[PDB]
Design an enzyme around this catalytic site. Structure first.
Site, mmCIF file in Angstrom:
data_model
loop_
_atom_site.group_PDB
_atom_site.id
_atom_site.type_symbol
_atom_site.label_atom_id
_atom_site.label_comp_id
_atom_site.label_asym_id
_atom_site.label_seq_id
_atom_site.Cartn_x
_atom_site.Cartn_y
_atom_site.Cartn_z
ATOM 1 C CG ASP A 181 50.496 48.587 35.276
ATOM 2 O OD1 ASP A 181 50.957 47.421 35.280
ATOM 3 O OD2 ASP A 181 50.601 49.362 36.263
ATOM 4 C CB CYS A 215 46.753 36.664 32.745
ATOM 5 S SG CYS A 215 45.145 36.207 32.019
ATOM 6 C CB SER A 216 44.523 38.992 36.887
ATOM 7 O OG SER A 216 44.033 39.046 38.254
ATOM 8 C CB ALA A 217 40.394 37.021 34.611
ATOM 9 N N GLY A 218 42.675 34.669 33.773
ATOM 10 C CA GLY A 218 42.905 33.466 32.936
ATOM 11 C C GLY A 218 42.075 33.458 31.643
ATOM 12 C CB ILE A 219 39.493 34.946 30.058
ATOM 13 C CG1 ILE A 219 39.202 36.257 30.795
ATOM 14 C CG2 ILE A 219 38.887 33.798 30.815
ATOM 15 C CD1 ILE A 219 37.701 36.661 30.802
ATOM 16 N N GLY A 220 42.226 36.758 29.222
ATOM 17 C CA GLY A 220 42.698 37.830 28.321
ATOM 18 C C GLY A 220 44.064 37.568 27.700
ATOM 19 N NE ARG A 221 48.003 41.400 30.898
ATOM 20 C CZ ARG A 221 48.558 42.007 31.966
ATOM 21 N NH1 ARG A 221 49.524 41.411 32.658
ATOM 22 N NH2 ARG A 221 48.155 43.233 32.304
ATOM 23 C CB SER A 222 45.397 33.212 29.736
ATOM 24 O OG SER A 222 46.091 33.392 30.969
ATOM 25 C CD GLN A 262 40.000 40.061 30.373
ATOM 26 O OE1 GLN A 262 41.227 40.181 30.521
ATOM 27 N NE2 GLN A 262 39.148 40.253 31.364
#
Ligand SMILES: Cc1nc(-c2ccncc2)sc1CN
Length: 280
Positions: A181, A215-222, A262
């Site tokens: 989280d 992921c949620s926004a498609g920029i960080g983990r992605s 991010q």
């Protein structure tokens, strides 16, 4: 400069925040005019995360061709990725339309449906064999075929049917379930084990359309997933693997989608993953 040495140099100096802000300052800025049209407001999860017009994926319909999704094309590595947001209640049909139209073999999911007690994306795939999903807006049927649950990830076999032509394809769903989280994993061992499980499937290979990653926004983990993949592939291909500059690869990828990586912790994690990955 051998990445491992640069790494220890930033770690000992504690300058991760300063490297990260230099990337943010040099990153490309291109127009996102289609994303900001009023007709598309409910197609965007976050007001500050939009696909550039030059690289956005277009839906094959005359009504409205818009989805929050970008094509990242890495010319020297010979890899393509589609990075997209977690689907919304009104974009689940658009999502599967895109998977169909682009001939993708795999979907990579790096988040849970609920995190920090809030919904991060729609429940967009079926949970039981005998309860299939129908997307009436895009004329598609989705069925769960099989499910393999492991400690760090789950792999699902799905059947996608174009109800218009009655063609079917097998889609593989690679779901990384243990990203915490807050912060980033302590060791990239389980993330790297996931990346090579996806690789072995054929989902990243040129005989299919691009893999869809979210992921949620498609920029960080992605961002972390496609930066680590491309960096290791370039270390395989080149005569001098130490020439691979993780910061230059990230700025090339940011020509195709804004905001990739991010936080300064995600940038440190990316370095960790490519260093430990190299050994093998
Ligand atoms: C072919 C290959 N396979 C790797 C691997 C395997 C299992 N677990 C983690 C990493 S590294 C590598 C170099 N191209």
């Amino acid at each position: 400069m051998e990445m491992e040495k640069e790494f220890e140099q930033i770690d000992k100096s504690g300058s991760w925040a300063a490297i990260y802000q230099d990337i943010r300052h040099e990153a490309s800025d291109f127009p996102s005019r289609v994303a900001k049209l009023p007709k598309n407001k409910n197609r965007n999860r976050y007001r500050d995360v939009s696909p550039f017009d030059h690289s956005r994926i277009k839906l094959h319909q005359e009504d409205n061709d818009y989805i929050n999704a970008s094509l990242i094309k890495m010319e020297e590595a010979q890899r393509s990725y589609i990075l997209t947001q977690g689907p919304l209640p009104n974009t689940v049909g658009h999502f599967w339309e895109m998977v169909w139209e682009q001939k993708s073999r795999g979907v990579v999911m790096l988040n849970r449906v609920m995190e920090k007690g809030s919904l991060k994306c729609a429940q967009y795939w079926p949970q039981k064999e005998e309860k299939e999903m129908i997307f009436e807006d895009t004329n598609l049927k989705l069925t769960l075929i099989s499910e393999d649950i492991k400690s760090y990830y789950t792999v699902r076999q799905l059947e996608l049917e174009n109800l218009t032509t009655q063609e079917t394809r097998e889609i593989l769903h690679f779901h990384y379930t243990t990203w915490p989280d807050f912060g980033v994993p302590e060791s990239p061992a389980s993330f790297l084990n996931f990346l090579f499980k996806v690789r072995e499937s054929g989902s990243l290979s040129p005989e299919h359309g691009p893999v869809v990653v979210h992921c949620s926004a498609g920029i960080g983990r992605s961002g972390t997933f496609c930066l680590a993949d491309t960096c290791l592939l370039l270390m395989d291909k080149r005569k001098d693997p130490s020439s691979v500059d993780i910061k230059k690869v990230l700025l090339e990828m940011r020509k195709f989608r804004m905001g990739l990586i991010q936080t300064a912790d995600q940038l440190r994690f990316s370095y960790l993953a490519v260093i430990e990955g190299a050994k093998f």
